[PDB]
PDB file of all heavy atoms in Angstrom:
ATOM      1  N   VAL E 104     -20.266  -0.480   4.901  1.00 44.48           N
ATOM      2  CA  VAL E 104     -20.252   0.287   6.133  1.00 44.48           C
ATOM      3  C   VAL E 104     -20.524   1.751   5.818  1.00 44.48           C
ATOM      4  O   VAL E 104     -21.386   2.373   6.434  1.00 44.48           O
ATOM      5  CB  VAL E 104     -18.907   0.177   6.852  1.00 44.48           C
ATOM      6  CG1 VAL E 104     -18.943   0.993   8.132  1.00 44.48           C
ATOM      7  CG2 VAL E 104     -18.610  -1.274   7.162  1.00 44.48           C
ATOM      8  N   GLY E 105     -19.794   2.298   4.851  1.00 42.06           N
ATOM      9  CA  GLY E 105     -19.986   3.692   4.486  1.00 42.06           C
ATOM     10  C   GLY E 105     -19.260   4.090   3.214  1.00 42.06           C
ATOM     11  O   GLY E 105     -18.434   3.343   2.696  1.00 42.06           O
ATOM     12  N   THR E 106     -19.563   5.282   2.714  1.00 40.96           N
ATOM     13  CA  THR E 106     -18.961   5.798   1.487  1.00 40.96           C
ATOM     14  C   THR E 106     -17.451   5.902   1.511  1.00 40.96           C
ATOM     15  O   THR E 106     -16.757   5.357   0.651  1.00 40.96           O
ATOM     16  CB  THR E 106     -19.458   7.189   1.199  1.00 40.96           C
ATOM     17  OG1 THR E 106     -20.884   7.198   1.271  1.00 40.96           O
ATOM     18  CG2 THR E 106     -18.992   7.636  -0.171  1.00 40.96           C
ATOM     19  N   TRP E 107     -16.960   6.652   2.490  1.00 43.54           N
ATOM     20  CA  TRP E 107     -15.541   6.887   2.667  1.00 43.54           C
ATOM     21  C   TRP E 107     -14.742   5.594   2.652  1.00 43.54           C
ATOM     22  O   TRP E 107     -13.937   5.372   1.745  1.00 43.54           O
ATOM     23  CB  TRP E 107     -15.303   7.617   3.987  1.00 43.54           C
ATOM     24  CG  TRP E 107     -13.949   8.240   4.103  1.00 43.54           C
ATOM     25  CD1 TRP E 107     -13.549   9.445   3.595  1.00 43.54           C
ATOM     26  CD2 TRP E 107     -12.806   7.677   4.746  1.00 43.54           C
ATOM     27  NE1 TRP E 107     -12.223   9.666   3.883  1.00 43.54           N
ATOM     28  CE2 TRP E 107     -11.743   8.595   4.589  1.00 43.54           C
ATOM     29  CE3 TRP E 107     -12.575   6.484   5.439  1.00 43.54           C
ATOM     30  CZ2 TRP E 107     -10.469   8.355   5.098  1.00 43.54           C
ATOM     31  CZ3 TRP E 107     -11.308   6.245   5.944  1.00 43.54           C
ATOM     32  CH2 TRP E 107     -10.270   7.178   5.771  1.00 43.54           C
ATOM     33  N   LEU E 108     -14.969   4.748   3.659  1.00 41.45           N
ATOM     34  CA  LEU E 108     -14.254   3.475   3.776  1.00 41.45           C
ATOM     35  C   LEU E 108     -14.393   2.619   2.528  1.00 41.45           C
ATOM     36  O   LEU E 108     -13.440   1.960   2.114  1.00 41.45           O
ATOM     37  CB  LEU E 108     -14.742   2.671   4.986  1.00 41.45           C
ATOM     38  CG  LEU E 108     -13.980   1.366   5.252  1.00 41.45           C
ATOM     39  CD1 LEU E 108     -12.626   1.680   5.835  1.00 41.45           C
ATOM     40  CD2 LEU E 108     -14.753   0.493   6.214  1.00 41.45           C
ATOM     41  N   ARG E 109     -15.582   2.618   1.937  1.00 42.34           N
ATOM     42  CA  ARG E 109     -15.816   1.842   0.728  1.00 42.34           C
ATOM     43  C   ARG E 109     -14.788   2.203  -0.328  1.00 42.34           C
ATOM     44  O   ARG E 109     -14.257   1.330  -1.008  1.00 42.34           O
ATOM     45  CB  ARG E 109     -17.204   2.125   0.169  1.00 42.34           C
ATOM     46  CG  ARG E 109     -17.383   1.637  -1.253  1.00 42.34           C
ATOM     47  CD  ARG E 109     -18.617   2.244  -1.879  1.00 42.34           C
ATOM     48  NE  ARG E 109     -19.842   1.784  -1.234  1.00 42.34           N
ATOM     49  CZ  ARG E 109     -21.038   2.329  -1.438  1.00 42.34           C
ATOM     50  NH1 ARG E 109     -21.162   3.357  -2.268  1.00 42.34           N
ATOM     51  NH2 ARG E 109     -22.110   1.847  -0.816  1.00 42.34           N
ATOM     52  N   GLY E 110     -14.507   3.496  -0.454  1.00 46.33           N
ATOM     53  CA  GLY E 110     -13.555   3.959  -1.450  1.00 46.33           C
ATOM     54  C   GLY E 110     -12.082   3.732  -1.161  1.00 46.33           C
ATOM     55  O   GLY E 110     -11.282   3.531  -2.084  1.00 46.33           O
ATOM     56  N   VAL E 111     -11.712   3.771   0.113  1.00 47.62           N
ATOM     57  CA  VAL E 111     -10.322   3.577   0.494  1.00 47.62           C
ATOM     58  C   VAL E 111      -9.974   2.098   0.572  1.00 47.62           C
ATOM     59  O   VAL E 111      -8.975   1.654   0.003  1.00 47.62           O
ATOM     60  CB  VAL E 111     -10.022   4.282   1.851  1.00 47.62           C
ATOM     61  CG1 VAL E 111     -11.079   3.935   2.855  1.00 47.62           C
ATOM     62  CG2 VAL E 111      -8.660   3.880   2.374  1.00 47.62           C
ATOM     63  N   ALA E 112     -10.818   1.335   1.254  1.00 45.69           N
ATOM     64  CA  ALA E 112     -10.599  -0.094   1.430  1.00 45.69           C
ATOM     65  C   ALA E 112     -10.434  -0.844   0.119  1.00 45.69           C
ATOM     66  O   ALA E 112      -9.860  -1.938   0.091  1.00 45.69           O
ATOM     67  CB  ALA E 112     -11.748  -0.695   2.226  1.00 45.69           C
ATOM     68  N   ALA E 113     -10.927  -0.250  -0.963  1.00 44.45           N
ATOM     69  CA  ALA E 113     -10.863  -0.876  -2.275  1.00 44.45           C
ATOM     70  C   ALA E 113      -9.472  -0.948  -2.894  1.00 44.45           C
ATOM     71  O   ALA E 113      -9.256  -1.705  -3.840  1.00 44.45           O
ATOM     72  CB  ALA E 113     -11.805  -0.168  -3.218  1.00 44.45           C
ATOM     73  N   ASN E 114      -8.529  -0.174  -2.362  1.00 44.78           N
ATOM     74  CA  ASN E 114      -7.164  -0.156  -2.885  1.00 44.78           C
ATOM     75  C   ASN E 114      -6.302  -1.304  -2.357  1.00 44.78           C
ATOM     76  O   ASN E 114      -5.136  -1.444  -2.735  1.00 44.78           O
ATOM     77  CB  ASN E 114      -6.526   1.192  -2.566  1.00 44.78           C
ATOM     78  CG  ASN E 114      -7.240   2.337  -3.251  1.00 44.78           C
ATOM     79  OD1 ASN E 114      -6.863   2.757  -4.345  1.00 44.78           O
ATOM     80  ND2 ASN E 114      -8.296   2.835  -2.622  1.00 44.78           N
ATOM     81  N   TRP E 115      -6.896  -2.125  -1.496  1.00 46.07           N
ATOM     82  CA  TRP E 115      -6.236  -3.282  -0.898  1.00 46.07           C
ATOM     83  C   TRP E 115      -7.085  -4.522  -1.177  1.00 46.07           C
ATOM     84  O   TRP E 115      -8.307  -4.425  -1.260  1.00 46.07           O
ATOM     85  CB  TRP E 115      -6.112  -3.080   0.608  1.00 46.07           C
ATOM     86  CG  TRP E 115      -5.015  -2.153   1.023  1.00 46.07           C
ATOM     87  CD1 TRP E 115      -3.727  -2.492   1.314  1.00 46.07           C
ATOM     88  CD2 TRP E 115      -5.112  -0.735   1.224  1.00 46.07           C
ATOM     89  NE1 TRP E 115      -3.013  -1.376   1.691  1.00 46.07           N
ATOM     90  CE2 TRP E 115      -3.837  -0.284   1.644  1.00 46.07           C
ATOM     91  CE3 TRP E 115      -6.148   0.198   1.092  1.00 46.07           C
ATOM     92  CZ2 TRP E 115      -3.573   1.054   1.934  1.00 46.07           C
ATOM     93  CZ3 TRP E 115      -5.883   1.530   1.379  1.00 46.07           C
ATOM     94  CH2 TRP E 115      -4.604   1.943   1.795  1.00 46.07           C
ATOM     95  N   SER E 116      -6.445  -5.684  -1.304  1.00 45.21           N
ATOM     96  CA  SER E 116      -7.162  -6.933  -1.582  1.00 45.21           C
ATOM     97  C   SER E 116      -7.968  -7.521  -0.419  1.00 45.21           C
ATOM     98  O   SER E 116      -9.135  -7.876  -0.590  1.00 45.21           O
ATOM     99  CB  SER E 116      -6.192  -7.992  -2.104  1.00 45.21           C
ATOM    100  OG  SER E 116      -6.065  -7.911  -3.510  1.00 45.21           O
ATOM    101  N   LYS E 117      -7.344  -7.648   0.751  1.00 44.17           N
ATOM    102  CA  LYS E 117      -8.023  -8.188   1.926  1.00 44.17           C
ATOM    103  C   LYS E 117      -7.952  -7.215   3.097  1.00 44.17           C
ATOM    104  O   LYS E 117      -7.264  -6.196   3.027  1.00 44.17           O
ATOM    105  CB  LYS E 117      -7.408  -9.528   2.333  1.00 44.17           C
ATOM    106  CG  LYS E 117      -7.555 -10.591   1.273  1.00 44.17           C
ATOM    107  CD  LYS E 117      -7.268 -12.006   1.784  1.00 44.17           C
ATOM    108  CE  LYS E 117      -5.789 -12.275   2.029  1.00 44.17           C
ATOM    109  NZ  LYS E 117      -5.531 -13.746   2.155  1.00 44.17           N
ATOM    110  N   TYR E 118      -8.667  -7.532   4.171  1.00 45.10           N
ATOM    111  CA  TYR E 118      -8.697  -6.681   5.354  1.00 45.10           C
ATOM    112  C   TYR E 118      -9.058  -7.508   6.568  1.00 45.10           C
ATOM    113  O   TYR E 118      -9.397  -8.678   6.450  1.00 45.10           O
ATOM    114  CB  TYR E 118      -9.759  -5.600   5.202  1.00 45.10           C
ATOM    115  CG  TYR E 118     -11.154  -6.172   5.124  1.00 45.10           C
ATOM    116  CD1 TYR E 118     -12.030  -6.091   6.204  1.00 45.10           C
ATOM    117  CD2 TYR E 118     -11.587  -6.829   3.981  1.00 45.10           C
ATOM    118  CE1 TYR E 118     -13.313  -6.657   6.143  1.00 45.10           C
ATOM    119  CE2 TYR E 118     -12.862  -7.396   3.908  1.00 45.10           C
ATOM    120  CZ  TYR E 118     -13.719  -7.307   4.986  1.00 45.10           C
ATOM    121  OH  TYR E 118     -14.983  -7.849   4.879  1.00 45.10           O
ATOM    122  N   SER E 119      -8.984  -6.887   7.737  1.00 43.82           N
ATOM    123  CA  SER E 119      -9.358  -7.555   8.972  1.00 43.82           C
ATOM    124  C   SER E 119      -9.887  -6.531   9.945  1.00 43.82           C
ATOM    125  O   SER E 119      -9.231  -5.521  10.219  1.00 43.82           O
ATOM    126  CB  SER E 119      -8.183  -8.280   9.619  1.00 43.82           C
ATOM    127  OG  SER E 119      -8.615  -8.900  10.825  1.00 43.82           O
ATOM    128  N   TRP E 120     -11.082  -6.793  10.457  1.00 40.44           N
ATOM    129  CA  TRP E 120     -11.699  -5.892  11.410  1.00 40.44           C
ATOM    130  C   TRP E 120     -10.895  -5.958  12.695  1.00 40.44           C
ATOM    131  O   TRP E 120     -10.414  -7.028  13.076  1.00 40.44           O
ATOM    132  CB  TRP E 120     -13.146  -6.313  11.682  1.00 40.44           C
ATOM    133  CG  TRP E 120     -14.109  -5.960  10.585  1.00 40.44           C
ATOM    134  CD1 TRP E 120     -15.040  -6.780  10.016  1.00 40.44           C
ATOM    135  CD2 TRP E 120     -14.260  -4.684   9.955  1.00 40.44           C
ATOM    136  NE1 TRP E 120     -15.763  -6.097   9.071  1.00 40.44           N
ATOM    137  CE2 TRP E 120     -15.306  -4.807   9.011  1.00 40.44           C
ATOM    138  CE3 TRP E 120     -13.614  -3.446  10.093  1.00 40.44           C
ATOM    139  CZ2 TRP E 120     -15.724  -3.737   8.208  1.00 40.44           C
ATOM    140  CZ3 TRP E 120     -14.029  -2.379   9.293  1.00 40.44           C
ATOM    141  CH2 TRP E 120     -15.075  -2.535   8.362  1.00 40.44           C
ATOM    142  N   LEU E 121     -10.729  -4.812  13.346  1.00 39.34           N
ATOM    143  CA  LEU E 121     -10.001  -4.757  14.605  1.00 39.34           C
ATOM    144  C   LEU E 121     -10.932  -4.194  15.655  1.00 39.34           C
ATOM    145  O   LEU E 121     -10.731  -4.393  16.850  1.00 39.34           O
ATOM    146  CB  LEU E 121      -8.766  -3.878  14.479  1.00 39.34           C
ATOM    147  CG  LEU E 121      -7.493  -4.595  14.914  1.00 39.34           C
ATOM    148  CD1 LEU E 121      -7.380  -5.909  14.162  1.00 39.34           C
ATOM    149  CD2 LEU E 121      -6.291  -3.721  14.642  1.00 39.34           C
ATOM    150  N   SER E 122     -11.957  -3.489  15.186  1.00 43.72           N
ATOM    151  CA  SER E 122     -12.969  -2.900  16.048  1.00 43.72           C
ATOM    152  C   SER E 122     -14.062  -2.261  15.221  1.00 43.72           C
ATOM    153  O   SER E 122     -13.805  -1.327  14.460  1.00 43.72           O
ATOM    154  CB  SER E 122     -12.365  -1.838  16.950  1.00 43.72           C
ATOM    155  OG  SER E 122     -13.399  -1.133  17.613  1.00 43.72           O
ATOM    156  N   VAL E 123     -15.282  -2.768  15.367  1.00 42.11           N
ATOM    157  CA  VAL E 123     -16.419  -2.221  14.639  1.00 42.11           C
ATOM    158  C   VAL E 123     -17.479  -1.834  15.652  1.00 42.11           C
ATOM    159  O   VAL E 123     -17.778  -2.605  16.568  1.00 42.11           O
ATOM    160  CB  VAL E 123     -17.026  -3.245  13.669  1.00 42.11           C
ATOM    161  CG1 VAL E 123     -18.130  -2.592  12.850  1.00 42.11           C
ATOM    162  CG2 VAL E 123     -15.948  -3.802  12.763  1.00 42.11           C
ATOM    163  N   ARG E 124     -18.037  -0.636  15.493  1.00 39.51           N
ATOM    164  CA  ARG E 124     -19.065  -0.150  16.403  1.00 39.51           C
ATOM    165  C   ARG E 124     -20.097   0.729  15.724  1.00 39.51           C
ATOM    166  O   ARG E 124     -19.769   1.738  15.096  1.00 39.51           O
ATOM    167  CB  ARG E 124     -18.434   0.629  17.558  1.00 39.51           C
ATOM    168  CG  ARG E 124     -19.389   1.598  18.240  1.00 39.51           C
ATOM    169  CD  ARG E 124     -18.736   2.283  19.429  1.00 39.51           C
ATOM    170  NE  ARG E 124     -19.265   1.784  20.692  1.00 39.51           N
ATOM    171  CZ  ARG E 124     -18.509   1.377  21.701  1.00 39.51           C
ATOM    172  NH1 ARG E 124     -17.188   1.412  21.585  1.00 39.51           N
ATOM    173  NH2 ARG E 124     -19.071   0.932  22.819  1.00 39.51           N
ATOM    174  N   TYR E 125     -21.353   0.334  15.873  1.00 40.82           N
ATOM    175  CA  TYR E 125     -22.460   1.072  15.299  1.00 40.82           C
ATOM    176  C   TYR E 125     -23.168   1.855  16.408  1.00 40.82           C
ATOM    177  O   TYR E 125     -23.693   1.279  17.365  1.00 40.82           O
ATOM    178  CB  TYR E 125     -23.427   0.104  14.623  1.00 40.82           C
ATOM    179  CG  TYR E 125     -22.857  -0.577  13.405  1.00 40.82           C
ATOM    180  CD1 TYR E 125     -22.455  -1.904  13.452  1.00 40.82           C
ATOM    181  CD2 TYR E 125     -22.733   0.101  12.204  1.00 40.82           C
ATOM    182  CE1 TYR E 125     -21.944  -2.547  12.324  1.00 40.82           C
ATOM    183  CE2 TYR E 125     -22.226  -0.530  11.069  1.00 40.82           C
ATOM    184  CZ  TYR E 125     -21.836  -1.854  11.134  1.00 40.82           C
ATOM    185  OH  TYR E 125     -21.359  -2.488  10.009  1.00 40.82           O
ATOM    186  N   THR E 126     -23.172   3.175  16.267  1.00 39.70           N
ATOM    187  CA  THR E 126     -23.793   4.048  17.246  1.00 39.70           C
ATOM    188  C   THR E 126     -24.978   4.782  16.641  1.00 39.70           C
ATOM    189  O   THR E 126     -24.871   5.361  15.559  1.00 39.70           O
ATOM    190  CB  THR E 126     -22.798   5.098  17.728  1.00 39.70           C
ATOM    191  OG1 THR E 126     -21.538   4.469  17.977  1.00 39.70           O
ATOM    192  CG2 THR E 126     -23.300   5.769  18.994  1.00 39.70           C
ATOM    193  N   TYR E 127     -26.109   4.753  17.333  1.00 41.87           N
ATOM    194  CA  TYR E 127     -27.290   5.457  16.853  1.00 41.87           C
ATOM    195  C   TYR E 127     -27.343   6.815  17.534  1.00 41.87           C
ATOM    196  O   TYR E 127     -27.034   6.938  18.729  1.00 41.87           O
ATOM    197  CB  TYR E 127     -28.567   4.685  17.181  1.00 41.87           C
ATOM    198  CG  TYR E 127     -29.825   5.496  16.951  1.00 41.87           C
ATOM    199  CD1 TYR E 127     -30.301   5.745  15.664  1.00 41.87           C
ATOM    200  CD2 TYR E 127     -30.512   6.056  18.023  1.00 41.87           C
ATOM    201  CE1 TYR E 127     -31.436   6.540  15.450  1.00 41.87           C
ATOM    202  CE2 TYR E 127     -31.643   6.853  17.824  1.00 41.87           C
ATOM    203  CZ  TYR E 127     -32.102   7.094  16.539  1.00 41.87           C
ATOM    204  OH  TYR E 127     -33.211   7.902  16.357  1.00 41.87           O
ATOM    205  N   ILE E 128     -27.733   7.831  16.771  1.00 41.06           N
ATOM    206  CA  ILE E 128     -27.834   9.182  17.301  1.00 41.06           C
ATOM    207  C   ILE E 128     -29.078   9.907  16.802  1.00 41.06           C
ATOM    208  O   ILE E 128     -29.259  10.095  15.594  1.00 41.06           O
ATOM    209  CB  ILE E 128     -26.593   9.995  16.949  1.00 41.06           C
ATOM    210  CG1 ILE E 128     -25.410   9.444  17.731  1.00 41.06           C
ATOM    211  CG2 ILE E 128     -26.809  11.460  17.279  1.00 41.06           C
ATOM    212  CD1 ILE E 128     -24.175  10.256  17.587  1.00 41.06           C
ATOM    213  N   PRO E 129     -29.942  10.343  17.738  1.00 44.47           N
ATOM    214  CA  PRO E 129     -31.193  11.052  17.465  1.00 44.47           C
ATOM    215  C   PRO E 129     -31.065  12.370  16.709  1.00 44.47           C
ATOM    216  O   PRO E 129     -29.974  12.935  16.580  1.00 44.47           O
ATOM    217  CB  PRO E 129     -31.784  11.241  18.857  1.00 44.47           C
ATOM    218  CG  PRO E 129     -30.579  11.409  19.690  1.00 44.47           C
ATOM    219  CD  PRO E 129     -29.702  10.293  19.189  1.00 44.47           C
ATOM    220  N   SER E 130     -32.207  12.840  16.210  1.00 46.25           N
ATOM    221  CA  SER E 130     -32.304  14.088  15.464  1.00 46.25           C
ATOM    222  C   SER E 130     -33.736  14.611  15.566  1.00 46.25           C
ATOM    223  O   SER E 130     -34.128  15.536  14.856  1.00 46.25           O
ATOM    224  CB  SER E 130     -31.938  13.856  13.996  1.00 46.25           C
ATOM    225  OG  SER E 130     -32.818  12.923  13.397  1.00 46.25           O
ATOM    226  N   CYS E 131     -34.512  14.016  16.467  1.00 48.95           N
ATOM    227  CA  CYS E 131     -35.905  14.404  16.664  1.00 48.95           C
ATOM    228  C   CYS E 131     -36.145  15.073  18.019  1.00 48.95           C
ATOM    229  O   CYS E 131     -35.212  15.283  18.788  1.00 48.95           O
ATOM    230  CB  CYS E 131     -36.800  13.171  16.524  1.00 48.95           C
ATOM    231  SG  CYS E 131     -36.341  11.799  17.594  1.00 48.95           S
ATOM    232  N   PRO E 132     -37.401  15.445  18.307  1.00 49.44           N
ATOM    233  CA  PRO E 132     -37.775  16.090  19.569  1.00 49.44           C
ATOM    234  C   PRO E 132     -38.070  15.085  20.678  1.00 49.44           C
ATOM    235  O   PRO E 132     -38.375  13.929  20.403  1.00 49.44           O
ATOM    236  CB  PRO E 132     -39.025  16.880  19.194  1.00 49.44           C
ATOM    237  CG  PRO E 132     -38.884  17.088  17.733  1.00 49.44           C
ATOM    238  CD  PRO E 132     -38.399  15.756  17.276  1.00 49.44           C
ATOM    239  N   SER E 133     -37.993  15.543  21.926  1.00 50.58           N
ATOM    240  CA  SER E 133     -38.257  14.705  23.094  1.00 50.58           C
ATOM    241  C   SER E 133     -39.679  14.188  23.040  1.00 50.58           C
ATOM    242  O   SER E 133     -40.051  13.304  23.806  1.00 50.58           O
ATOM    243  CB  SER E 133     -38.062  15.512  24.376  1.00 50.58           C
ATOM    244  N   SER E 134     -40.464  14.749  22.123  1.00 50.39           N
ATOM    245  CA  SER E 134     -41.869  14.396  21.957  1.00 50.39           C
ATOM    246  C   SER E 134     -42.158  13.317  20.910  1.00 50.39           C
ATOM    247  O   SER E 134     -43.276  12.806  20.841  1.00 50.39           O
ATOM    248  CB  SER E 134     -42.668  15.656  21.632  1.00 50.39           C
ATOM    249  N   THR E 135     -41.166  12.969  20.096  1.00 51.55           N
ATOM    250  CA  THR E 135     -41.343  11.951  19.055  1.00 51.55           C
ATOM    251  C   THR E 135     -41.503  10.550  19.632  1.00 51.55           C
ATOM    252  O   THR E 135     -40.714  10.128  20.472  1.00 51.55           O
ATOM    253  CB  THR E 135     -40.145  11.916  18.115  1.00 51.55           C
ATOM    254  OG1 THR E 135     -39.959  13.205  17.521  1.00 51.55           O
ATOM    255  CG2 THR E 135     -40.368  10.886  17.037  1.00 51.55           C
ATOM    256  N   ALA E 136     -42.505   9.808  19.180  1.00 49.75           N
ATOM    257  CA  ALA E 136     -42.688   8.465  19.721  1.00 49.75           C
ATOM    258  C   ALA E 136     -42.036   7.410  18.860  1.00 49.75           C
ATOM    259  O   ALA E 136     -42.033   7.517  17.632  1.00 49.75           O
ATOM    260  CB  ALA E 136     -44.154   8.151  19.874  1.00 49.75           C
ATOM    261  N   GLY E 137     -41.489   6.391  19.514  1.00 49.72           N
ATOM    262  CA  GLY E 137     -40.848   5.311  18.789  1.00 49.72           C
ATOM    263  C   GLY E 137     -39.628   4.735  19.475  1.00 49.72           C
ATOM    264  O   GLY E 137     -39.024   5.384  20.330  1.00 49.72           O
TER     265      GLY E 137
END
Side-chain angles (χ1 to χ4, degrees), chain E residues 104-132 135-137:
Chain E
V104 180
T106 310
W107 196 82
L108 184 74
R109 165 195 294 168
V111 48
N114 297 266
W115 283 270
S116 272
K117 297 194 287 196
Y118 64 105
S119 180
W120 284 132
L121 234 53
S122 170
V123 185
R124 158 177 252 130
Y125 293 105
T126 316
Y127 169 75
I128 291 187
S130 61
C131 54
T135 302

